Amino acid sequence: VNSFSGYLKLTDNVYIKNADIVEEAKKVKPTVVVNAANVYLKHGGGVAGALNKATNNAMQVESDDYIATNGPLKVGGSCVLSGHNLAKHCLHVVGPNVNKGEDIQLLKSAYENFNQHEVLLAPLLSAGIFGADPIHSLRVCVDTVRTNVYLAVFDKNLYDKLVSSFL
Numbered sequence: 158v159n160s161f162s163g164y165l166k167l168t169d170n171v172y173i174k175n176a177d178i179v180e181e182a183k184k185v186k187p188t189v190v191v192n193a194a195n196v197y198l199k200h201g202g203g204v205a206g207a208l209n210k211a212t213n214n215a216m217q218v219e220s221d222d223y224i225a226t227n228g229p230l231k232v233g234g235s236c237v238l239s240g241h242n243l244a245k246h247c248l249h250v251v252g253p254n255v256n257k258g259e260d261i262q263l264l265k266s267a268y269e270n271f272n273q274h275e276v277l278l279a280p281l282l283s284a285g286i287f288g289a290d291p292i293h294s295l296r297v298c299v300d301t302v303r304t305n306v307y308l309a310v311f312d313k314n315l316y317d318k319l320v321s322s323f324l
């Protein structure tokens with residue numbers, strides 16, 4: 158039993174809700190919140206910009222030190238950093254950005270990072286401003302993640318579309 162509330166159950170381990178991931182994280186304070194990161198951990202817009210803003214830019218400061226030490230992530234890769242005031246940990250995961258020409262096949266690799274954590278709050282990877290089809294992202298999530306994932310979909314219209322089309 159966990160403290161996530163109001164989610165629709167899609168499969169044994171995948172759940173979905175129309176919600177602002179920032180407000181969800183502030184309420185639940187999960188062990189792991191997933192950020193829709195880029196390889197430079199530059200949290201400018203979309204989920205990343207919103208999460209970072211909610212940390213008063215502390216996420217960006219921590220991320221800049223991470224990059225200065227380790228260099229960029231790989232597309233499909235991840236790193237674990239602090240969750241600041243939002244969660245215990247933030248799993249920064251880089252899905253392919255279609256608006257950059259990156260290989261959508263890497264979306265499965267991106268979701269594989271979730272399997273290293275028993276429970277996560279997360280967005281749909283490569284959706285939104287990353288330019289991939291969210292219906293496809295949800296399908297890859299369900300077919301790749303085996304741990305317990307609570308998906309927050311900001312757009313109510315898209316949420317209704319994802320549920321009604323879910324196979």
Ligand SMILES: C[C@@H](O)[C@H](CO)Nc1ncnc2[nH]ccc12
Nearest residue numbers: 178204280281284285309311312
């Ligand atoms: C891009 C997809 O992940 C989804 C599409 O609606 N975007 C979001 N989902 C949840 N919380 C969010 N906070 C800011 C953006 C956002």
Ligand SMILES: [Cl-]
Nearest residue numbers: 203204285286
């Ligand atoms: Cl977005």
